[PDB]
Amino acid sequence: TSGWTFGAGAALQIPFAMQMAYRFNGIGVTQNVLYENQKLIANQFNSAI
C-alpha cells in the first residue's frame, strides 16, 4: 500500500502500479517500461507466485 515509506516514517499511500514504476527506476529501467508492459509484468508476477 505504501512503498518503502512506512519504513522511513508514516505510510504514504501510493498506487501499486506506481510503486512498481518506482522500483523500475531504481534498477535503471525507465518507468514507461513498467506502464507500457504492466499487464505482462503482472502476469509474470502472478505466475511466479
Partner: peptide, 21 residues
C-alpha cells in the same frame, strides 16, 4: 497502452519565444 492515463496540457517553453519572434 498506459492504464489510467489522464488528459492535460503540457507546456512547451520554446513555443512562446519563437511565437513572439
Amino acid at each position: 497502452v498506459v492504464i489510467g492515463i489522464v488528459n492535460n496540457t503540457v507546456y512547451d517553453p520554446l513555443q512562446p519565444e519563437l511565437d513572439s519572434f
